[PDB]
Ligand binder design. Structure first.
Ligand code: SF4
Ligand SMILES: [Mg+2]
Ligand SMILES: [Zn+2]
Ligand SMILES: [Zn+2]
Lengths: 86, 506, 58, 166, 46, 130, 43, 443
RNA sequence: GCUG
DNA sequence: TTTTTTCAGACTAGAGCCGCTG
DNA sequence: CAGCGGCTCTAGTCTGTCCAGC
């Protein structure tokens, strides 16, 4: 009867908690790159597209997308600075 | 407007036996019976509380409705509830399987101890398309054989020795055995550096050599948690059905109240035990006391799954015999034989059997009393309309009469005696069902209870006679092995046209 | 007796809904001896899950 | 309008065994799929043809005959490129209600795109001035069952000019 | 407060009350005992 | 015998000479004190009303063996009876920290998906995000 | 094991209330009622 | 390790796509599986499986080899897929150890998987010039200078020779002159270098500033002569230590020699076995400090002192009361930190025994917390998966009422608080996984 | 316990 | 603290055993 | 001279013992 009242608690609150957003200063550098590459990995060639949308669409028609200085000089050096195995 | 929603029914193609993860149990449970160790009958007027009888998991009394739905005892299915075990415990059903996984996996890094070359051969065997249940049991014995034969590991070199089910619900593993060969330094340091323990306990110094890892539910939980996904197939577990961790118990689904109109008493004891250990930890209780409480809670959970549990400790032996879940599915009175293979059946009668040489071999004389009680449902079909109306007029008391009428639109049955029979006869329309009394020419199945061959059930045509006794021709008594020295035989009336025809033809 | 079974899970439900994969869409009716419904419930309570696959009659 | 190939298991009760199947299935399938929107499909209307009817089983219970029926039924589903012609069966201040003539009064146009004299001010003003045409724009259907409408449309009216009527 | 809980005869054939004895048991509790008599002639199946 | 005592009152008193540390310069070996800590233990610490003015080394050393578990210096040469090298050094934390709000909750560990404790709507990350 | 059993034999079809494949169940039944796969309409 | 597979489902979902995750994560779940068997079990058409494996072999997540049947069984290495989580951290230490040019070198090497020299120098000649001043064009020769400069310290290693099996097709993997040869990044060299930052921060934040630098210059001159499987570093003399000191220091040889015999003799102990073994316990201790306060952390360090001496001293050796202590033991037991009673030798009796002694086992408490930290980043990403699809209406409005904008800055406060917190738990993985790899023989 |  | 109250039965581990098997 | 392979062995243990009818 001592516990026969309700679900123990909606949540259990721990009197001690997390410290902070630890290592605060320097992960501004990594933290933007977290969002930088994710902006570029999604907009990459190495991804797949929902061709199941286009086989789902029987409404295909014209006028819609569904229907539609490197300044450098030559050189050649091939180094074996790396392993000679496998 | 309104969408097109189809209404239809389906058949069971393949039962896939599986388990449920402790998170998956909570998903199907509607409430948490973490409530009272009290019975839940409230202090005044016997109403339900928030615990085991929560009426949110069903109703076992017709008057009180359930809380998930407004359905009454008849219309409700069942709803489930959960009890969160404070210290993890083993399931006695899966315990031998648990000892097997520990022998198969490395106690330290947890990968099955099957050589990389050996693993490839076995994995292909599993890939073979026709793996019947028989083949799978076979591989486990073989894979297990190689592993119990692998004291070292191809993964980390951790030394994994013998897991041997010591005691009841206890698993014991070597790790640090003592041998005539020079002892390894790590084991020697473990057994020689506890000087204070040797000083405090005199018995420890002579027995200092003996010391093996004891695998308790808490260690098993972590080890089973860390087995690789790749290595769950070679443990011969279907990963979709279950995974190694679900073998150890964290939450128990409390049964729907429909399935329990002594199991409930066991649940209250388990709830009380869960409260005692939790209070003891806050109070500050010795580990041996906490382990004894853990053992008592483990025993109560096992007594819930399998009541007899041979090997019970003397101190915690059960006060009374209780029927836990195994003792409900086992035995002649058990659900499998008592309620599934053989079932009590309606539309049947048992009377003493007497001789009648004047009856054809295909006929049985049925007492007029049994004929009035036993009824066959006949649908008005344009050829029986005149005959049915006359029997409706005769009503329940007269022998060529009916005891109920069901209209085509509704499943409601109107008793002929209480109402006006003449009006119902006129109202009769094609497609309504009249439960006429058994009449001459009906097909009944006759059965002698000590049935030993095919001929103990035989059909018979039924011809009602005044005397009370099932009288048949005496030529057909050696198939029944029935003499008339006080014998009684059973009559069954098939209630479908498809069943009637199979009985007459076959 | 008639029980409501879900297509995805394989677990019995109530009134065309499953409190498990809270999506009514897959619930379908079945005819079963009521005793079997008790066995499936007692199995599910004891952790043996009798998952059911439903196929339309053809 | 579009044809939709569908497959159904149609149960003929045994007191209809006089009539031919392909007619007596068609009388059932009209009672199964009329005035009913099918989710992601459209508003079924009637039966076009029965393209393939396969063999009439009879199951161990019912005694009826269950023929699996392949058929084609015409449904209502605008193609997101149709200029329809309906009637204003209602005017709400948030947007007008047009109805196709005795078809479905469930097309609800939002009105934000016609010429900058646009308001419905609750005294049934259609449009502040400068059969009714409609451009059906999106498909939008909501499956109803949720516990123990449904093809609504959004309908536009661009700069058509509407030479005959404003 | 009182809900009737009657003792009702349930015999497929009529019986005649022969003796009705009213007494008190070890703890006085108004035990009432009735003897019902039925006479049966030999019939087919005896 | 002294169970009616709070050594948590005395743990700061055996800590505050090891926080200040005059001459953190590395001019020499800086072989650091354990005997002066026994010296400050015997005559007078920081001020506190103390009933056990009797000074035994067997009742005073025990506050150290708790405070080693509270990250303070190890024992160097306590093998001598009263006076030997006895090297000590207060250990500053060798790491930073490593946790998060979700590392704190035991019951919230259960979830695994959107369920009754699904992390798509937990209270704890909602509290942490303000 | 994740044992997927089909429901066959008689000791399971009697338990699951599904007609057995033995005896009468081996052969299915068809209706000879007036039917044909008909021609469609021109669209 | 199901929570590990929970992340590989999450990591591929955010980076490439969904079917490259699905065919990817199934291959983690069923292993050495042929091309036709994968397309039949996942229910995926064979044209999409050939593309999905093509992207997966490019980023070096799925490795192929045939043994007997003449049919190639693809196989995905699990622990490589989680290294995508460390990807922006792999960028940053190439900015501390190399310039912005070489930092972009390891970036597009991590992004596009397999690269030749003739491509990756051509790409950074586009990206670095478009951010620099037009007319002040960055000359590509300095890129080729810093390209090899990465390779002499062996931060970039080449791909193993291609099997060129008949089933494998050469044309599909390259994305469309000179051929050249391909390479990935040597992320294993980073796991040395990330460990090099780990030990130098372990000494500097414990011993002294001058103690850590001689550890750094010891390890900076022991880079090529060791590997990650080295049980400890190559042994050095103290005379080349005085040669390899940086020019910022001015310390005399004999005073640092006193610090050299000081640093050699510690409880910490360069013993690379003991270094990760001591750093892992501080990671454990910083979790009980995070979770159960300093009082339970005080008894957590007590069991690391004595192996099997417990419950007859732990009420004495920390002086905290018996009520308050024994809830800390059972909470360390129930969360699997305190490990267990592996000393009971009386036969089959919970009540009557030789008294169960607690004992921490460092690896079972390690593998759990690694499994916990794998579970942790599942709850991080899924929240950032949650808060994204709602707010898409107002991201393109900038491309707006007062609660509309206020939801965005509470979103961008949230995502940046989530994404920063994916990395702070990531440093706990490597600090513990390198300890896991250091105690694992035959791998 | 007895009938079957 | 002190009795038994059917009769097999073909599985499952251990205990060895001796001898070749290296 | 040493080891692990199968043996081989005793007991150990859980598992049944007709249908139902009052
Ligand atoms: S968010 Fe998910 S994981 Fe993090 S705490 Fe709440 S529940 Fe546990
Ligand atoms: Mg007889
Ligand atoms: Zn209900
Ligand atoms: Zn469901």
């Amino acid at each position: 009867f001592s516990k026969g009242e309700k679900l123990p608690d909606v949540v259990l609150k721990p009197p001690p908690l997390f410290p902070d957003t630890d290592y605060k200063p320097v992960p501004l550098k990594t933290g933007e790159g977290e969002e930088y590459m994710l902006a570029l990995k999604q907009e990459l060639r190495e991804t797949m597209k929902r061709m199941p949308y286009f086989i789902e669409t029987p409404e295909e028609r014209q006028d819609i997308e569904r229907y539609s200085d490197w300044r450098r000089l030559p050189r050649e050096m091939m180094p074996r600075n790396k392993c000679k195995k496998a | 407007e309104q969408f097109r929603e189809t209404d239809v029914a389906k058949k069971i193609s393949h039962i896939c036996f599986g388990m449920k993860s402790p998170e998956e149990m909570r998903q199907q449970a509607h409430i948490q019976v973490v409530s009272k160790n009290l019975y839940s009958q409230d202090n005044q007027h016997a109403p339900l509380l928030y615990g085991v009888l929560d009426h949110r998991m069903g109703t076992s009394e017709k008057d009180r409705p359930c809380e998930t739905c407004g359905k009454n005892l008849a219309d409700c299915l069942g709803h489930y509830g959960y009890i969160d075990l404070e210290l993890p415990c083993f399931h006695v059903g899966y315990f031998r399987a648990v000892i097997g996984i520990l022998q198969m996996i490395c106690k330290t890094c947890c990968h099955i101890m099957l050589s990389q070359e050996e693993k490839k051969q076995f994995l292909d065997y599993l890939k073979r398309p026709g793996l019947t249940y028989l083949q799978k049991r076979g591989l486990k014995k073989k894979i297990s054989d190689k592993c119990r034969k692998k004291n070292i590991c191809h993964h980390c070199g951790a030394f994994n020795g013998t897991v041997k089910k010591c005691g009841l619900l206890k698993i014991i593993h070597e790790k640090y055995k003592t041998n005539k060969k020079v002892v390894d330094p790590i084991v020697s340091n473990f057994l020689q550096s506890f000087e204070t323990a040797i000083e405090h306990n005199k018995e420890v110094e002579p027995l200092l050599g003996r010391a093996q890892e004891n695998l308790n539910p808490l260690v098993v939980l972590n080890l089973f948690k860390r087995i690789p996904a790749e290595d769950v197939p070679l443990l011969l577990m279907n990963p979709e059905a279950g995974k190694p961790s679900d073998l150890i118990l964290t939450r128990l689904l409390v049964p729907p109240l429909c399935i329990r109109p002594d199991l409930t008493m066991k649940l209250t004891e388990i709830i009380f035990l869960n409260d005692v250990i939790k209070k003891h930890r806050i109070s500050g209780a010795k580990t041996q006391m906490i382990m004894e409480d853990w053992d008592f809670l483990q025993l109560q959970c096992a007594l819930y799954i399998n009541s007899e549990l041979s090997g019970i400790p003397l101190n915690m032996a059960p006060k009374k015999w209780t029927r836990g879940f195994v003792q409900r599915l086992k035995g002649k009175q058990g659900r499998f034989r008592g309620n599934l293979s053989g079932k009590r059946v309606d539309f049947s009668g048992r009377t003493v059997i007497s001789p009648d040489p004047n009856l054809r071999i295909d006929e049985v004389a049925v007492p007029v009393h049994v004929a009035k009680i036993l009824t066959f449902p006949e649908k008005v079909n344009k050829a029986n309309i005149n005959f049915l109306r006359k029997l409706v007029q005769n009503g329940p008391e007269v022998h060529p009469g009916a005891n109920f009428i069901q209209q085509r639109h509704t499943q409601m049955k109107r008793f002929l005696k209480y109402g006006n029979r003449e009006k119902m006869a006129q109202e009769l329309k094609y497609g309504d069902i009249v439960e006429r009394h058994l009449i001459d020419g009906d097909v009944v199945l006759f059965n002698r209870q000590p049935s030993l061959h095919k001929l103990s059930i035989m059909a018979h045509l039924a011809r009602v006679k005044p005397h009370r006794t099932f009288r048949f021709n005496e030529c057909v008594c050696t198939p029944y092995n029935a003499d008339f020295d006080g014998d009684e035989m059973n009559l069954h009336l098939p209630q479908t046209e498809e069943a009637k025809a199979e009985a007459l033809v076959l | 007796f008639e029980v409501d079974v879900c297509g995805q899970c394989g677990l019995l439900g109530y009134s065309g809904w499953c409190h498990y994969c809270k999506s009514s869409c897959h619930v379908s009716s079945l005819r079963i001896p009521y005793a079997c419904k008790l066995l499936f419930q007692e199995l599910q309570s004891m952790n043996i899950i009798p998952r059911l696959k439903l196929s339309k009659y053809n | 309008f579009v044809l939709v190939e569908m497959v159904d298991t149609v149960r003929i009760p045994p007191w209809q065994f006089e009539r031919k199947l392909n007619d007596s299935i068609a009388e059932e399938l009209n009672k199964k799929l009329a005035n009913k929107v099918v989710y992601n499909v459209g508003l079924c209307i009637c039966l076009f043809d029965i393209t393939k009817l396969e063999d009439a089983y009879v199951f161990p219970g019912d005694g009826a005959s269950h023929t699996k029926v392949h058929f084609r039924c015409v449904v209502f589903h605008p193609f997101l490129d149709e200029i329809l012609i309906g009637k204003i069966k209602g005017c709400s201040p948030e947007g007008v209600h047009v109805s196709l003539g005795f078809f479905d009064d469930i097309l609800i146009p939002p009105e934000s795109l016609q010429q900058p004299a646009k308001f419905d001010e609750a005294e049934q003003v259609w449009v502040w001035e400068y059969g009714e045409e409609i451009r059906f724009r999106v498909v939008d259907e909501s499956f109803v069952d949720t516990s123990p409408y449904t093809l609504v449309g959004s309908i536009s009216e661009p700069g058509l000019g509407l030479l005959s009527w404003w | 407060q009182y809900k009737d809980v009657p003792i009702t005869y349930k015999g497929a054939t009529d019986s005649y009350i022969e003796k009705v004895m009213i007494s008190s048991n070890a703890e006085d509790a108004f035990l009432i005992k009735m003897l019902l008599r039925q006479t049966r002639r030999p019939e087919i199946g005896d | 015998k002294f169970l009616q005592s709070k050594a948590e009152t005395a743990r700061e008193s055996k800590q505050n000479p090891m926080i200040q540390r005059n001459s953190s310069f590395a001019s020499s070996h800086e072989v650091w004190k354990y005997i002066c800590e026994l010296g400050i233990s015997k005559v007078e610490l920081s001020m506190e009303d103390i009933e056990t003015i009797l000074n035994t080394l067997i009742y005073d050393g025990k506050v150290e063996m708790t405070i080693i578990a509270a990250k303070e210096g190890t024992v160097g040469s306590v093998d001598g009876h009263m006076k030997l090298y006895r090297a000590v050094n207060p250990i500053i934390p060798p790491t930073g920290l490593v946790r998060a709000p979700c590392g704190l909750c035991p019951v919230f560990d259960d979830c695994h998906e959107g369920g009754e404790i699904s992390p798509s709507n937990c209270i704890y990350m909602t509290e942490w995000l303000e | 094991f994740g044992q997927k059993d089909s429901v066959c034999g008689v000791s399971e079809c009697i338990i699951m209330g599904i007609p057995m494949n033995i005896g009468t169940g081996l052969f299915k039944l068809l209706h000879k009622a007036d039917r044909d796969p008909n021609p469609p309409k021109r669209p | 390790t199901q929570a590990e597979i929970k992340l590989c489902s999450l990591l591929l979902q955010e980076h490439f796509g969904e079917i490259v995750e699905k065919i990817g994560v199934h291959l983690i779940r069923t292993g050495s599986q042929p091309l036709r068997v994968i397309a039949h079990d996942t229910g995926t058409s064979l044209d999409q499986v050939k593309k999905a494996l093509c992207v997966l072999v490019q980023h070096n997540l799925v490795s192929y080899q045939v043994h007997k049947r003449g049919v190639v069984e693809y196989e995905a290495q699990c622990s490589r897929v989680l290294r995508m989580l460390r990807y922006p951290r792999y960028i940053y230490t190439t900015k501390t150890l190399y310039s912005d040019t070489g930092e972009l070198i390891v970036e597009e090497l991590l992004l596009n998987g397999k690269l030749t020299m003739s491509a990756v120098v051509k790409k950074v000649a586009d990206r670095l010039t478009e951010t620099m001043e037009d007319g002040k064009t960055m000359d590509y020769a300095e890129v080729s200078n810093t390209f090899v400069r990465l390779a002499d310290t062996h931060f970039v290693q080449r791909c193993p020779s291609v099997p060129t099996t008949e089933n494998s097709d050469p044309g599909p993997p390259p994305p469309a002159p000179d051929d050249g040869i391909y390479w990935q990044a040597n992320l294993d060299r980073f796991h040395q270098h990330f460990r090099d930052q780990a030990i130098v921060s372990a000494v500097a934040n414990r011993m002294d500033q001058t103690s850590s630098e001689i550890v750094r210059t010891m390890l900076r001159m022991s880079e090529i002569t060791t590997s990650s499987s080295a049980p400890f570093t190559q042994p050095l003399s103290s005379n080349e230590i005085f040669r390899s000191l940086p020019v910022g220091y001015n310390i005399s040889k004999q005073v640092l020699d006193q610090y050299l015999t000081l640093l050699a003799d510690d409880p910490l102990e360069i013993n690379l076995h003991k270094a990760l073994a001591s750093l892992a316990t501080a990671t454990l201790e910083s979790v009980v400090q995070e979770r159960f306060g300093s009082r339970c952390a005080r008894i957590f360090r007590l069991v690391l002192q004595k192996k099997h001496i417990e419950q007859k001293q732990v009420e004495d050796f920390a002086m905290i009361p018996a009520k308050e202590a024994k809830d800390m033991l059972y909470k360390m037991l129930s969360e699997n930190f305190m490990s267990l009673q592996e000393i009971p030798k009386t036969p089959d009796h919970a009540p009557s025994r030789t008294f169960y002694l607690y004992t921490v086992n460092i690896l079972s408490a390690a593998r759990m917390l690694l499994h916990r930290c794998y579970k942790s980043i599942a709850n991080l990403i899924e929240r950032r998966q949650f808060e994204t699809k709602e707010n898409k209406r107002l991201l393109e409005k900038s491309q707006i009422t007062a609660p509309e904008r206020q939801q965005l800055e509470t979103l961008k406060r949230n995502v940046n608080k989530l994404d920063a917190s994916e990395i702070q738990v990531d440093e706990t993985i490597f600090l513990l996984e390198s300890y896991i790899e250091c105690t694992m023989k035959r791998q």
